[PDB]
Amino acid sequence: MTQFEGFTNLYQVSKTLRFELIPQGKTLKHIQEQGFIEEDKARNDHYKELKPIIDRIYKTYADQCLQLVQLDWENLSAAIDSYRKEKTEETRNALIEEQATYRNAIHDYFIGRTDNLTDAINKRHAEIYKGLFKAELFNGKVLKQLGTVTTTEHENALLRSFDKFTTYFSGFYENRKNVFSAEDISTAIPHRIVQDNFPKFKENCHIFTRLITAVPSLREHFENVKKAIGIFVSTSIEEVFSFPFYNQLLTQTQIDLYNQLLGGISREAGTEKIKGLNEVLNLAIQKNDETAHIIASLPHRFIPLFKQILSDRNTLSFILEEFKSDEEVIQSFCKYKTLLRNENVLETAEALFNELNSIDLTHIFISHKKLETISSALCDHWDTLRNALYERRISELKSAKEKVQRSLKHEDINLQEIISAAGKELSEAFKQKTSEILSHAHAALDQPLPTTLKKQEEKEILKSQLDSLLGLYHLLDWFAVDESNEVDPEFSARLTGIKLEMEPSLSFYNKARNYATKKPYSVEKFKLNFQMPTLASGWDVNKEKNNGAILFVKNGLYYLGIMPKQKGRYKALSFEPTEKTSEGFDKMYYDYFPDAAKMIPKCSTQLKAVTAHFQTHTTPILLSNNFIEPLEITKEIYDLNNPEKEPKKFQTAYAKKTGDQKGYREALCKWIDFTRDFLSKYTKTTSIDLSSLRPSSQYKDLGEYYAELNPLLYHISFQRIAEKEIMDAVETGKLYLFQIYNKDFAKGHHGKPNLHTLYWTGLFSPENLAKTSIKLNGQAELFYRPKSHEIIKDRRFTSDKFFFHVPITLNYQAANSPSKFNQRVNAYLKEHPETPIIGIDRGERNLIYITVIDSTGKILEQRSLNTIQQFDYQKKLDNREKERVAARQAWSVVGTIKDLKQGYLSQVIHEIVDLMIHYQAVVVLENLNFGFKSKRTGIAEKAVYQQFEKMLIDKLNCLVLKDYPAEKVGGVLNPYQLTDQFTSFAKMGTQSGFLFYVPAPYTSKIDPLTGFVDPFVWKTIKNHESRKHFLEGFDFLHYDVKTGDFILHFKMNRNLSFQRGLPGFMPAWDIVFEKNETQFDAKGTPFIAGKRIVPVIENHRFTGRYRDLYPANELIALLEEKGIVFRDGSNILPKLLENDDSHAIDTMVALIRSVLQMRNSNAATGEDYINSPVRDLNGVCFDSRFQNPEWPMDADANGAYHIALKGQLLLNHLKESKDLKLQNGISNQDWLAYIQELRN
RNA sequence: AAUUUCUACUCUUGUAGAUGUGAUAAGUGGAAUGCCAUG
DNA sequence: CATGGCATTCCACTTATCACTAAAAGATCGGAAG
DNA sequence: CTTCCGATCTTTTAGTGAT
């Protein structure tokens, strides 16, 4: 009999707290007189400058090592294909094994253990390999082996700035160690080569060979465009798309050559761009030929490869020069303005366009590709001028129209015919627009430049002048000045001269755009070090004179003490622990031993002396230093930890590989006895009680033993010291004292404290001291941020502050990772079949819409969360989004949206966890693909599909209710754990504890009452033949005279091609065209039944705005226009399908498509609702506007209700699941069949 | 209109909720500008 | 006045790893022997 | 004068997971 309260202390979590340190006493002066702050600032700047210099060495060895790589990729491609055809777990394991094999194979080059290279090269590469993670990067002991790096004197002098300070780069050492590593790490070199770039290359190879097989003419196109680009000249375009060529494309130069081949080299502004492979494929698409329709079906785009990790991009395309200061761009534009005003651009321009009223316009032509711009600038529609040209060429005449359009589409047109075409309105519009543009250019030229670019108004003034000049240049780019057609000579000469004078303005505009849109400089905190290489790395008493960090507790207040190096050496300041009754501070004593897997072999078996002893003679060795009794090590004890193979005989991987469970148990028992002896004899750990440990043979696995053992090694005690000693120490300067401070420690607070402050108080609560539930961690760091009733805005930004980030670890008694979390959750769920379900749906019209259903699916509560605590966050997000959109086009600062979304999601998360605790429910979200959420985030960054899942999973990883007592489940010492330990979204599966994932579609556009979904994908029908075929599948349609509504019948045995291929459980639906009368809801407002909201598509190619539709009214209007009688109640379809007019069938199909659009929304009126086209078997046509609380009110409420039903289906399958598992996703067929089973 | 920090209020020189930091790397999406095409 | 495919710059933004570390090893130097 | 040893401050290192 399990319980909901049993989901606590299942796995450890790690969190970091942040506090402001208040200086205590004279220590502010005593830190200013030493100048440590400026020293750490200069250290940080030197580190920032010197990080890319080391990266050159890493890039150099990466480029050198990969050029020697030679592998066959056939096996990896075969594994990828075999896993691609069917998704089963053993092919997944085979693919994982092949990926690991290839990853190790390439990593052997970096390690120096490959078989395809000589032994001397292997030794040289290994000798290099041992040096990039230690101090020889700075001393040059590994720098000489490459030689090609060629560091000059300034870097070498700046490398000596970090002397005796190599441990600063330790985090950087770990960061770089992830790169040259083979354990499927997403930042690593070989993971990228095997899993990121190679599947893309295989996809590109298969796409290219399918294109070649389908049609052969592009081979000449591809080879010719490759020769025009001039990349990979020594090899063929057939060979470049082959698996042996993937022995190249490891170094960044080859990848950049491939990418520039695929995209095409781009020259500077105003110059024709060399096309790429994807570009010529798109151009082949846009021809709209039958061969274009052939490759429209096929995948018609290659994929570029990803960048190499440590390298940098280089491109053959043009790179624009960059302005470096606002003064520089200001003086450059001022000198440009003086030059442009000295040559007198506007005088010759104005003199040039007034000739157009009085010159032979048969000799003035217009570029054919720019006439659309002229038409859009002169008319309300872009098509007008080309239509006028089309009908005049018709008027001076199937092949005739084709001749007209092919002369229209490519050949430049004389201006005289165009003025003859449009009439006069184009001529006065032309002269008026040219007058407006030169007036704008004149106003920009005369009005001067401001002194600087500090404020946004100066930026928009400069922007306004610049695009005035750009629009002028656009105006001169209208004319076709080329000599292929007739042109007046002096006209062409003056136009070319004024155009080349206007030419450098466009690149100037792009340069100013690049400089102006830079992020403004802000002050930023940096790590303090106090000249300690290992400041606050660990809290231990042995290291307290080295790490220098010591805490004190003073009558509920907390104080951090830092003692510095006195005269450049570690003067061991000491204190005498006095009686408790004496006044003073409470020093925390930190007796801790790290993870025994990481510690016992270090100080027992992997010692230098032991290794030297055992290679020579087999006799056992006694170890006495730092042991209170001499400790013996035997040959086989050393041999288990050092077996010359990866699987140790006490490791369960060896037991899995060989199956020798008996030998594994024996080796494990001997290892446990040995480490028990070590913990008995070691000086640090001889005082720690081990009586809670089980005997050796009772431990199932070594990791279980380690998870048991580690909590015993961590202990905290407190000692009282005289206040006089600490005050004298801080007054002397031998100790810097700071108070850990936040808002909650202020004397004026009365309310509930912050959750972080609750965590901090719970760690130092005496119950946590007695039994360690919340563990203080090491690796603390110090940050200094400079400067950036009576109440002051941004008071915390008014002075420099010292920050203090400290990590803590919770649920410490539990293991570092949970075991079978989802199986425990499913066991509890099977124990409690009546668990409620909460569905969370995300949308853009309304952000969060919740529905709570029971086991039988009845709604207990539904609610929109556009407003929490009477604050409509949706309007604020929408306002912020258009503010950002307007600012990003006005060259203003962009700002951030994350803080406002985080503030909304804080209240949202609190609401969901309150509902979770009050109902003991589960939470279901839709499984959103990364592509879909990224596309909708790009369409609308206001919406919150991402960052809500992360915050949810973070909150249920460890949950503490503030009102709860500290000892209760859900308290600070016993936090709830509802979700699995979050690793990453890639490995996060279909179920994370109490939170589930279901497939997205068929949750909104469906009937709640009946489960009906429209099956007709509408792209199957385009012409009247296919439309009439779609009508033939329907059974009959008649008019009901007693209710005024049409009744239409349909079966899935017809119109199967136009269906989306999902047969429902009902073989028949009764489509009803409700009479468009009005009804009153429960609130009493009138609403029109059967109404539809349809976009305007009258122009047949573009989408307009929204409009209301009344399908019964439109149907009777069309039928009475056709004269078809329907008051007899007869069948209407044969009376209608007999008529062969295409517009009647088009309108009928449009009405059918309109009436199945259950989703009816329009943001202009603020109305969104669902109507059911199919009447329920209880004689009800469902409409959400009736405001029945039994059913969803809105669209997103319906979607939330249906994902809750999907979760209900999953839990119902879980109840009959003997394996305590879940389905590998739910197909749409099973979901729709199940909901149709419930509804019918 | 105060906060380690963020959000929302302002009875309280404050309230409610949230808050895994640092380093590193990759990727995504907008906006502008061109170039080639299509409607 | 829109769409498709590229290219350059700028911005914000998300995702994915690592550490959460005491003690041995070693570099080094001031102080002690031949 | 000429040569080596013990204190002391950096630096690196050790590495576990289901019949």
Short mmCIF file of C-alpha atoms in Angstrom, two decimals, chain A residues 41 44 48 519-526 784-788 796-801 803:
data_model
loop_
_atom_site.label_atom_id
_atom_site.label_comp_id
_atom_site.label_asym_id
_atom_site.label_seq_id
_atom_site.Cartn_x
_atom_site.Cartn_y
_atom_site.Cartn_z
CA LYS A 41 39.53 42.91 -12.62
CA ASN A 44 39.59 38.76 -15.60
CA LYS A 48 39.21 37.10 -21.50
CA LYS A 519 24.12 45.82 -28.03
CA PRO A 520 24.84 48.75 -25.68
CA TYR A 521 27.70 48.33 -23.26
CA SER A 522 26.75 47.41 -19.69
CA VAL A 523 28.83 46.94 -16.56
CA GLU A 524 29.30 43.29 -15.64
CA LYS A 525 30.44 41.50 -12.50
CA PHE A 526 33.62 39.43 -12.36
CA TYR A 784 32.06 42.11 -7.46
CA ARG A 785 29.69 44.23 -9.53
CA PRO A 786 30.54 47.94 -9.86
CA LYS A 787 28.14 50.89 -9.91
CA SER A 788 25.54 50.96 -12.68
CA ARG A 796 20.42 48.16 -5.52
CA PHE A 797 22.09 49.61 -8.65
CA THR A 798 23.22 52.78 -6.85
CA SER A 799 26.43 51.30 -5.40
CA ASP A 800 29.02 48.58 -5.90
CA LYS A 801 28.09 45.29 -4.27
CA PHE A 803 27.94 38.93 -4.61
#
